[PDB]
Amino acid sequence: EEEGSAGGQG
Amino acid sequence: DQPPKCDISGKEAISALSRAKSKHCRQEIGETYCRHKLGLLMPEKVTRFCPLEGKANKNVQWDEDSVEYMPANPVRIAFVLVVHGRASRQLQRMFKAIYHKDHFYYIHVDKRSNYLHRQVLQVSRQYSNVRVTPWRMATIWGGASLLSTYLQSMRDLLEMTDWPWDFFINLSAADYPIRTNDQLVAFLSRYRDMNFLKSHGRDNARFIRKQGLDRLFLECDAHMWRLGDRRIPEGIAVDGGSDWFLLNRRFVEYVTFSTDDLVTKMKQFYSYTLLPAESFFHTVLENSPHCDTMVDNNLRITNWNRKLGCKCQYKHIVDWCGCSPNDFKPQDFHRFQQTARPTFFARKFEAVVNQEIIGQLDYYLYGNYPAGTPGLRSYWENVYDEPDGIHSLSDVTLTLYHSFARLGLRRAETSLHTDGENSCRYYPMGHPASVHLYFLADRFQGFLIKHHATNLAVSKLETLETWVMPKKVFKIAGRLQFSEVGTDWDAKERLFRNFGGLLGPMDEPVGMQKWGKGPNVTVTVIWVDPVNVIAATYDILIESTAEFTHYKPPLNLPLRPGVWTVKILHHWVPVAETKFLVAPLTFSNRQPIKPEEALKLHNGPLRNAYMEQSFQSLNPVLSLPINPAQVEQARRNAASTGTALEGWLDSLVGGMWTAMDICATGPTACPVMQTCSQTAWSSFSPDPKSELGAVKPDGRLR
């Protein structure tokens, strides 16, 4: 459904 | 260690300079930092050649009748497989499902995975349309080297004149097709001038911050170092999403050979980017002269479940938190029949996690196998291969693979019942030649050790394979379903990646519990070492939604070797218990352990206690008396080496593992030994679903 593998800095 | 060329004052840059190991890695960090400080590393503005106002997104209004016709001029695909790991048989199964002689296959194996590479070579040698990349990079997760892998293979593929390909598809060993090859070719033949990339579609500013695209990153020592900040170049649109796509030859030509302001600067910008392939190809396309070819659909299904797949699991590899899609299960099969949009591939699939859904999907596409086909429900996975060396192993796995081999040798002797010469007595020789995991019906069955031994009756070397299975140790006396101890807990798939539970003195066990539906409850946990010493105790809250719970108690090392015990209580009421083995090591640095080492390792922690808080009070209240003799024998065991130490270990393994069977690979003098190729469990037994043979008239292998 959604895309983007990075979660974030924390 | 000469100082840098500029004063380095950034918190991020200095934090990286400290944790870095190699000198080369320290200087390469300083150079990168000083270049960007002077404004000479990252571009500031970029030319946009797209004539459109923004994004195009040409639609492919899907009707099932779009994949039924026969193309008079079918496309020929260049499949690029970026693989890594041990699942050589699963990769062979998927390669068998996507193969057609008219296509081409270019395989890049991670530098870390030499075993997998040796197997892939045997495939490239059988088929003229299969080749392996002579170059191999350590493609860590999020590493910038992934885009460098793709961009090189595109260059290499465009220069292979004898390969007239039209599309470019990238697949991993965890991908699998969800539609036939005939339908793929028909669909792509009708849209051969399009490019298939999937965007995030959500907020763009939040996508940039979450992806860290405004952060400087460097790949070095197999790590992604976060060095500082950077600005987003002005005058261009930045987009991204999934890094699995299909690109046509004309657009691959542009990315490779163009020298305009867009491609040149974007190759510099993304050389220092985390997860570049998730954004580089989108940005270039939407800002290039080909911006009117973008279809906002990668033709993939990705099993995203952020409730399980986002645990900042890559923290030790990159300076950022990462997410990972989950593995499909049998209940997810109906999702592969969805009508909404066109989809041809899906991920992720892991045989060691769940093979049933793989078998279902493959037979749904290409039919069942004949009756009597062996091995359809089994899976084998090599975990050690002789050419990689025993220094590739640890001291634990080496001590315990030797033990399993001996355990198998003792079963051969006891199997032959006779009063004369025992032609099934063996003397072990050398080191294991290979090890395999073994699964049946998605149930772990144990290890398969291949090893050499001398048959003492005829005084000849023989090659053998042994199957050992662990003994069930979980006992119930409620919401509790299971309880286990091990290392390498996978939070995403909620299981241990150390399957055998192989542990040594210096390891750090983790106690997991599995719960079913019910109201909240609080339980108690108690750890007990082999001589009835209570190492730790703690209570846990099991909420109504709790399905799995785990924890790693802080125990001073080394642990006392032997059979440990973990008990669960509910207000003094026993609930269940489980047992795990802490094996004493017969190897130190891959050499026979010395007394000064064995002494200092097999005799409890260096602080005479596992924690600061003691628990001698609970021993009488649990019928756990400490015997002065067993404690004495444990201290006498710690001193043993060689033969005596071998008898100690093998006695522990024997009490926790079962030699299920043993087979010979070649001729043997033991009359009660079956040939490995004739068994059902051996890695030498037939496994046609993963075996690659000659091509058929339809150009297929499956």
Numbering used by the authors:
A (entry chain B): 211 to 220
B (entry chain A): 252 to 728, 735 to 959
Q: What is the paper's account of this structure, in its own sentences?
A:
To visualize how the different amino acid substitutions are accommodated in the peptide binding cleft, we selected five variants of the bikunin-derived peptide for structure analysis (peptides 3–7). Three bikunin variants bound identically to the wild-type peptide: peptide 3 (proline at position −3), peptide 5 (alanine at position +1), and peptide 7 (proline at position +3). Position +1 has a strong preference for small amino acids (G, A, S, T, C; note that serine may act as an alternative acceptor). The limited range of amino acids permitted at the position +1 is readily explained by the shape of the peptide binding cavity, which features a narrow constriction on the C-terminal side of the acceptor serine. Curiously, all but one of the known GAG attachment sites have a glycine in position +1, even though XT1 works equally well with glycine or alanine. A constriction within the peptide binding cleft requires the acceptor serine to be followed by glycine or alanine.
The first enzyme in the pathway, peptide O-xylosyltransferase (XT, EC 2.4.2.26), catalyzes the transfer of xylose from uridine diphosphate (UDP)-α-D-xylose onto serine and thus determines the site(s) of GAG attachment on the core protein. XT1 and XT2 are type II transmembrane proteins consisting of a short amino-terminal region facing the cytosol, a single transmembrane helix, a stem region required for Golgi localization (Schön et al., 2006), a catalytic GT-A domain (Lairson et al., 2008, Müller et al., 2006), and a unique C-terminal domain of unknown function, termed “Xylo_C” in the Pfam database (Finn et al., 2008). XT1 has a two-lobed structure, with one lobe comprising the catalytic GT-A domain and the other comprising the Xylo_C domain. To better understand the initial step of GAG biosynthesis, we have determined crystal structures of human XT1 complexed with UDP-xylose and various PG-derived acceptor peptides.
